[PDB]
# Entry
Amino acid sequence: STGSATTTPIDSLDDAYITPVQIGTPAQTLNLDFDTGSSDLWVFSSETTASEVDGQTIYTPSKSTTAKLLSGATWSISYGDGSSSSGDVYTDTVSVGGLTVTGQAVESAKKVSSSFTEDSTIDGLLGLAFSTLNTVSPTQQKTFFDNAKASLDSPVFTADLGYHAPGTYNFGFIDTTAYTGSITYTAVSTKQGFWEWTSTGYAVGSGTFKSTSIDGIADTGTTLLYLPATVVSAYWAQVSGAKSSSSVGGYVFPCSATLPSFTFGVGSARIVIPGDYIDFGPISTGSSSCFGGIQSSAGIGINIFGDVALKAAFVVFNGATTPTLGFASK
# Structure
């Protein structure tokens, strides 16, 4: 089997992407944030504290003939940005882009933190990291990808995120028309439960390539590119007037600037992030200070190849017995 679904930016900055997901019988379609940095499929629901729901579409298990309470199971998750959610668990039928899993753990939110409430466009998350990070207790549950894997034509999914435009998540096949040149594959460590890999270096603009190992995670659920302070300083030093602002919470730059590209290495191959992808606009409405898309990972504890980086590539998440990651230009 295979599946193919379009993923759409939630706003003009590509702050996140939402993908429609069918849950239950008859289908209830919710727009979920596919997140390769976590492993829970959780939704706003009829059980969510009413004061914490503001415009989201909810899953109502009582209206699904295939929903079953997973008795005694609870979940609770905290994300790298300080947001969180928790609740109980149902199993139900879940379909993405024509690919159907029966018995999928659908984690129903009883509580969500303010950032989730305030984002009317995201109805929940669909985790695509390794199932070892799933938070369901006392019986850990599998991700949608892990459940689908054995049925898939090939045990892979691909992320093809757009810049200010829709893109595609495919399950079970590699669309050879969706990228240019060849896909370069690189080793993955699953030791922390992430799609963790080592970039071979970077370049700023038309500068020379610096060969250096950068361990990090491919994370579709993180907006920006978080890299070591040395790398990030070298990038922003090429933008007149750019500076790190503790009050704003990262590097800002004059909105009048033209940003240089940023290149990252995948083995001997190179992925080029155009300068425009690094512009996240005014720090507040009407400001001439703009927020940078490349930020320091210092104090996160891990480097994160988030959407800024991934949207410059066609990315293969290969879930074979020994997982790997592939990157192609597009």
Observations:
- Helices lie at 114-118, 144-148, 229-236, 307-310.
- The chain has two domains: 5-174, 175-330.
